[PDB]
Amino acid sequence: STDMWIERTADISWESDAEITGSSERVDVRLDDDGNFQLMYKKGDTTTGVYRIMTRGLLGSYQAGAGVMVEGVFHTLWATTKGAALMSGEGRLDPYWGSVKEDRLCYGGPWKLQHKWNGQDEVQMIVVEPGKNVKNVQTKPGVFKTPEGEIGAVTLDFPTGTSGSPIVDKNGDVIGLYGNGVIMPNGSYISAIVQGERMDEPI
Amino acid sequence: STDMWIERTADISWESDAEITGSSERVDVRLDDDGNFQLMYKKGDTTTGVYRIMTRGLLGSYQAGAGVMVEGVFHTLWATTKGAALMSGEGRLDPYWGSVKEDRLCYGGPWKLQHKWNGQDEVQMIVVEPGKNVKNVQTKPGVFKTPEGEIGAVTLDFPTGTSGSPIVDKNGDVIGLYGNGVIMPNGSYISAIVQGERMDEPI
Hints:
Oligomer: homodimer
Largest sheet of chain A: 9 strands, antiparallel
Subunit structure (chains A, B): Forms a heterodimer with NS2B. Interacts with NS4B. Interacts with unphosphorylated RNA-directed RNA polymerase NS5; this interaction stimulates RNA-directed RNA polymerase NS5 guanylyltransferase activity.
Membrane topology (chains A, B): Peripheral membrane protein
Number of strands of chain A: 17
Order of helices and strands of chain A: EHEEEEHEEEEEEEEEEEE
Protein name (chains A, B): Serine protease/Helicase NS3
Distance between the termini of chain A: 32 Å
Number of domains of chain A: 1
Subcellular location (chains A, B): Host endoplasmic reticulum membrane
Domain Peptidase S7 (chains A, B): 41-203
């Protein structure tokens, strides 16, 4: 009886067609037993992939954000759930680590995301825009002037319900998440590639 | 030294050109003293109009929502500021009344918005999309099935930073605000016309 739940909506993969034309709708198929198509107290389902973050409202459901499931751990921005538990399949997901300053949050275990943009190559964002089929969008990040140092950031503009969508390199490795955009002197919006170093479970 | 501020970005008016083509960018001009153009402990500026709601973040500013200023009172959704004070010009605006259930909130005085959609005519939304010039968009609302009764709602889809943008009738009267969209059985999103009855200041 939690207030939020996650739904798997895509695989983690760099798309050649998105490298071909700039944007490509994902064809993550799923069949029944006859061949018919369908495109996308317990511990919850941690199947690796890209997830929508849904929550119930006054008059219906809506997508509060997005996240990525890696190594049995769900990663998202802090601002998408602010720590609320997540229903995943038959079970539930409780927050494990988070940082309001870094705008990062992970469920089921510590932060597992390790790779980061190399600063030269182009990247593909697995866009999970609300009410929109999942698509990979190719774009070139950039190093921008921040008081927080010099972080990678992308020029794409998507609704805040897309925040937390994973960004991947040519290997399909998640180099960061899509954060909430900030405004530029010209009036446009820039979203940073939200990423931190991998932390570990001692034992 | 508040954390949020509002910026006036449009007048409250029904646009004939939006009634002509469906959508029309607003031409709310403003001149200097030479004729050059520019398009859009104290009590803050309550100049009647349409406002962007901006807030500072880690790496810059962003639009948290929108609102409308009527009769010296700023109206917006509760979810845009959640009660945070607002800098308006030389002064500040403190929340006066609000309702989390109704998703309504007003600063500087009680709720002044009285008119509501008549259920038959078309309406124009003064869209204050983040990073976008303000435009009026014509659309026909509809009465939809809700457990909360039967409320008016529009089929337009805009980022949550647009939430709180005023919706007006042919007279330019604000018949409600643009709420956060909820999902439909088909997967699309529907935004209700957030409106309540006018409350008064006794004396």
